[PDB]
Swiss-Prot record:
Record keyword Acetylation present: yes
One of the GO BP terms on file: regulation of T cell proliferation
Annotated keywords: Acetylation, Cytoplasm, Differentiation, Disulfide bond, IgE-binding protein, Immunity, Innate immunity, Lectin, mRNA processing, mRNA splicing, Nucleus, Phosphoprotein, Repeat, Secreted, Spliceosome
Subcellular location: Cytoplasm; Nucleus; Secreted
GO molecular function: carbohydrate binding; chemoattractant activity; disaccharide binding; IgE binding; laminin binding; molecular condensate scaffold activity; protein phosphatase binding; protein phosphatase inhibitor activity
Motif (Nuclear export signal): 114-129
Phosphoserine carried by residues: S76
Job description of the protein: Galactose-specific lectin which binds IgE. May mediate with the alpha-3, beta-1 integrin the stimulation by CSPG4 of endothelial cells migration. Together with DMBT1, required for terminal differentiation of columnar epithelial cells during early embryogenesis. In the nucleus: acts as a pre-mRNA splicing factor. Involved in acute inflammatory responses including neutrophil activation and adhesion, chemoattraction of monocytes macrophages, opsonization of apoptotic neutrophils, and activation of mast cells.
Descriptive protein name: Galectin-3
Chain residues that bind a beta-D-galactoside: W69, G70, R71, E72, E73, R74, Q75
Protein source organism: Homo sapiens
Record carries keyword Hydrolase: no
Known tissue expression: A major expression is found in the colonic epithelium. It is also abundant in the activated macrophages. Expressed in fetal membranes.
Gene that encodes the chain: LGALS3
Whole-protein residues included: 114 to 250 of 250
């Protein structure tokens, strides 16, 4: 088991064909999960499943630049379940991050941060038991 929050270095940043795989289990009564792809203090891609926002479940995605959050992108398709094992795959493509959960396509997030090779950390945080976090080039 990994300790959360967990930092995964992404050496030399991200690049198309880089596949990041996160395995874990959502805690019972979870409130949130966050994946934060970081460029220094900025968050190039924030992926934030929320389990109770006004008693609804929603994934919020955004970018943090100079400590300001941008315009949120919201997805109501919500494949996570409290208590249950999940797999998140983030595949870097030329124009977006492409996210699949449990082998099903979920969403894409267009690159707002252009310096992919400076997005050199992934923070994994929130209400999970984290089993593994890794990357490979496909
Ligand atoms: C309060 C909180 O949860 N802080 C988190 C931070 O959460 C923000 C993001 O999810 C953004 C993405 O757009 O939304 C913010 O809420 C919006 C909300 O969606 C809007 O409807 C509303 O109108 O505005 C608010 C705020 O603009 C969330 O507050 O996400 C970051 C990245 O994961 C977290 O780091 C932060 O938690 C803090 O992290 C610190 C270390 O990084 C410390 O752990 C600190 O104690 C945490 O509170
Ligand atoms: Cl940039």
């Amino acid at each position: 088991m990994l300790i959360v929050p967990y930092n995964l270095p992404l050496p030399g940043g991200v690049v198309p064909r880089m596949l990041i795989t996160i395995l874990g289990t959502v805690k019972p009564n979870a409130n949130r999960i966050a994946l934060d792809f970081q460029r220094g203090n900025d968050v190039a891609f924030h992926f934030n499943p929320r389990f109770n926002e006004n008693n609804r479940r929603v994934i919020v995605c955004n970018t943090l630049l100079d400590n300001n959050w941008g315009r949120e992108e919201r997805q109501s398709v919500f494949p996570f379940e409290s208590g249950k094992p999940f797999k998140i795959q983030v595949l870097v493509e030329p124009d977006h991050f492409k996210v699949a959960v449990n082998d099903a396509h979920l969403l894409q997030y267009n690159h707002r941060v252009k310096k992919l090779n400076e997005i050199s950390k992934l923070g994994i945080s929130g209400d999970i038991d984290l089993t593994s976090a890794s990357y490979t080039m496909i």
